[PDB]
Paper text:
The macromolecular SMN complex facilitates the formation of Sm-class ribonucleoproteins involved in mRNA processing (UsnRNPs). Here we report on the identification and structural determination of the SMN complex from the lower eukaryote Schizosaccharomyces pombe, consisting of SMN, Gemin2, 6, 7, 8 and Sm proteins. This creates a central platform onto which Gemin8 binds and recruits Gemins 6 and 7.
The structures of HsG6/G7 (47) and HsSMN/G2 modules are known but the basis of G8-mediated bridging of both modules has not yet been established. We therefore expressed and purified complexes composed of the S. pombe proteins SpG6/SpG7/SpG8115–166 and the corresponding human proteins HsG61–92/HsG746–131/HsG8190–230, respectively. The C-terminus of HsG8 adopts a helix (α1)-turn-helix (α2) motif and interfaces with the N-terminal helix of HsG7. This interface comprises several highly conserved hydrophobic residues of HsG7 (A60, L67, L70, L71, F92 and L97) and of HsG8 (Y205, I212, M215, A218, V219 and F223). A hydrogen bond is established between the sidechain amino group of HsG7 Q56 and the carbonyl group of HsG8 R203. In addition, salt bridge interactions between the guanidine group of HsG7 R63 and sidechain carboxyl group of HsG8 E216 are also established. The corresponding S. pombe proteins SpG6, SpG7 and SpG8115–166 share 21%, 29% and 21% sequence identity, respectively, with their human counterparts. This allowed us to build a homology model of the S. pombe SpG6/SpG7/SpG8 complex based on our crystal structure. Our results thus demonstrate a conserved modular architecture of the SpG6/SpG7/SpG8 sub-complex.
Residue numbers in the entry:
A (entry chain B): 47 to 131
B (entry chain A): 2 to 86
C (entry chain F): 191 to 227
The structure:
């Protein structure tokens, strides 16, 4: 008896989520750069993200004004982020 | 919208394709789809850089405007993303 | 009161048979974070 379409969707969600979660784990011990609003580019040392909403906890956040020892960059504040594994 | 209402099998079909993504504030990205977070719809791209290294960029799902497929990508892409982390 | 049952049902809706695999992954990523978040 065939796998339902719904079961296939659920496997695809799980595959997509697993790959995403691995990409977050890969950020541990790396710098991460962010593209924010008003074209602002910042970078920091990665600490964590929330797993429901893509908020970022970072340290030594470098902005055009200065360095913030610890920061929470809220998901609504971010357009994109980039890192090098 | 449009990206955020795709289902998981539709998101999954983008994996390993080269896409152009337009996002908030006229940010633009070209890269190879690694995954889409099914919770946030965040798109994760991989770029093969000129110096031979790789970067990884996450675009917040809420900032995505359009995603256009540029190329289908061969077995070497699959192997590269396989050894990314 | 079992405050996590609604979440478990949603994880089952979303991930089906893979729900516990995904929960274990999210747990492990948390640990890796919470170690030095």
């Amino acid at each position: 008896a065939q796998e339902s379409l719904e079961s296939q969707e659920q496997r695809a969600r799980a595959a997509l989520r697993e790959r995403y979660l691995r990409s977050l784990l890969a950020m541990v011990g790396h710098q991460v750069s962010f593209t924010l609003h008003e074209g602002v580019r910042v970078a920091a040392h990665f600490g964590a993200t929330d797993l429901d909403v893509a908020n970022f906890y970072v340290s030594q956040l470098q902005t055009p004004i200065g360095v913030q020892a610890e920061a929470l960059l809220r998901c609504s504040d971010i357009i994109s982020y980039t890192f090098k594994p | 919208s449009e990206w955020m209402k795709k289902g998981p099998l539709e998101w999954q079909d983008y994996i390993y394709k080269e896409v152009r993504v337009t996002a908030s504030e006229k940010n633009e990205y070209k890269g190879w789809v690694l995954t889409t977070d099914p919770v946030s719809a965040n798109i994760v791209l991989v770029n093969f850089l000129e110096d031979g290294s790789m970067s990884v960029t996450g675009i917040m799902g809420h900032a995505v405007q359009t995603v256009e497929t540029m190329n289908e990508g061969d077995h070497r892409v699959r192997e590269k993303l396989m050894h990314l982390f | 009161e079992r405050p996590g049952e609604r979440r478990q049902a949603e994880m089952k809706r979303l991930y089906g048979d893979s729900a516990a695999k995904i929960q274990a992954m999210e747990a492990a990523v948390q640990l890796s974070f919470d170690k030095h978040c």
